[PDB]
Every structure is written in structure tokens, then in C-alpha cells.
Amino acid sequence: NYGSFTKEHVLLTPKGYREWVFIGASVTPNELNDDKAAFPEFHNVYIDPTSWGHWKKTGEFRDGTVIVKELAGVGSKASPSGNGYFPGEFNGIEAMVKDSKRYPERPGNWAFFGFESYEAKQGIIQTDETCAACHKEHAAHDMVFTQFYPVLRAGKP
Template identity: 35%
Template sequence: MALLTLAVAAWSFAHAKSEEQVNRARFAADGSVTRPIEWRQWVHVGSRYKPIGLNILDQKLTKTPEILNAYVEPSAMAVYQETGQWPEGSQIVKEFTAVQVGPGCDSKTFVCSTRFGDGIYESRYIGLGYMVKDSARFPEQPGHWGYFSFGHQPEPYLPTAQPTTTCISCHVTLASDTDYVISKAHLGLNRSTR
């Protein structure tokens, strides 16, 4: 029994400690969030090639296919890997890039022949979406996730963003069993592949 109590205490301590250590997003008094910095140094959990279609940030038709790169803030990722749960404060980014088009590139497949070899190449950054788990700020939202867009545009992105509710429905439809993070679409979040 003493051993069990000790084990539970040790678990709670480790758990609380890691939750406490999760880095937090920066919010202003008006409820807007500041764009994170250095998200490209976060944990890259996967990419998706999306053919020409509507972009979720502005609901407008894209000019080229886009590549969607997802990054998780490392301290949140550490807890997720340990527990399979997204801790309070988790931050996840989805950055969009436009693919290369023009001379040397096939206009249907977007495969370009370059001196580096044939391939579909990213040409520039073109948008940034962001999710933050915060139960105090988003008590009513599924999973307490807040969603933000820093624009579907070339850099520089918007420096701050107000929460938007246009994102919620897809995440609810597609991922109510995985805390509204569409983890099954990202190789790096599929815990069974560890």
C-alpha cells in the first residue's frame, strides 16, 4: 500500500511538473494572441500536399497546390509523447507553403525539373494557422482549443490574431476521439508508430 501511495505520488508529481513546464502562448488584454516565434524549430510532425482548392485561413481558392507543415511546441510534445494527452497550454502551428510553378514545371503535376532533380518544390511561405489549448480562455470550446489565423499571405504574417470560430467544426467532425487534434493525419503524432 505504501508503495502504491508512493507510486501515485511520484506519478502525480511527474505529471504536474510536466504540465507546469509547458510553455505558454502570449495573450494581450484584448484577447488577441501574439504570433509565436521560431515555430520552425518546433517539432515537425508531418506535411500534407494539398491540391489547388480552398484554403482554410481565408476560404479562398489557392493559386497553386500548397504544402501544409504541422509543428508542435516541444514542451507540449514531450507531455503528449509521454501521456498521449495534450496538456494545458499546448501550441500547434500549421504553416502553408506555395509550390514552385513556371518554367520547367509541369502545370498539372507540379513536378519541376531542376538542377537538383525532379520534384515538387516548396517556393515560399504563404500562411500560418495556430491552435492553443487554454481552459481559462476557451472554456466553452471543444477540448478548450482556441484557433487563430495569422493570414494567408506571404511573410510577414500578421503579428497578432483574435480567436476565430470558423475552424472548430472540421476539427470536431474529424477528431473528436483524439482531442480535436487531427493526429491520425500526421505521421509524427501517430503514437503507434513509435
């Protein structure tokens, strides 16, 4: 079980998630979003190893699934490989945890967490309006935007 939680079932700030299973990266640069992306700017997304094993067998997110979206800045727009976007420095993380026992009234049993900094002890749980509304509305599978996770789409049975 890769998440740890407070008494009130708040996700403690994940550690070592960069050693979890990467499932996809997207980029919303500030310069293409009126100088402020909602989630600036590169997004590197990870699912915990245990939930990955379960996804390879079921194509479903189990209770205990932790997904971390790590934000990084655009570091440059041209390299020897051509023009585009290339990452810079880390900016922070978002996370979501699915758990029908801890979050029985949350849409999809998912809890969404923001993090004040990489130094924070624990996440801040989010109201449904702030995160779950957009994800339920538009994500291809169980409030996870799998249309942007080719690792997931190719790993499911």
C-alpha cells in the same frame, strides 16, 4: 510555456515556431482543388517543444499546447527525384491553442487563430463554425488531425 497572449487571451504571433517539433506535412495544391485550395498549398505542422514532451509521456494535448500549421506554395511538380509536389515560398500560418483556463467555453478548450500576415502582432480568434466544427467532426484525436501526423502517432506511449 511557448504561447504568449494579450489581456483578452489572444495568441501573439508565434516566433521561432520553425524550431518547434515538426509533426507532419500534407499538400492540397490549388490545381487539385478547382484552382483554389482552402489552405494553399503545402502544410508544415509543428507542436511546441513543451507540449511535445507531454505528448511523448501521455498521448494527450496539455493545457498550453500550441500547434502551428504553416502554409507554403507549390514551387514545382518535377525534380530529379521524380514527379510530385515540391514546396515554394511561405504563404502564412494557422494556429490552435488548447487551454481550459483561457478558453473554457470553446469546443475542446481549443482556440483557433488566423493571422493577417507574417507581420501581424497577434492572431485573430475564430468562431467555432470557421475552424473547430470541421476539426471536431473529423480529427482523429481531440480536434487534432493526428491521422496525418505520423510523428505524433509514433511518439505517443
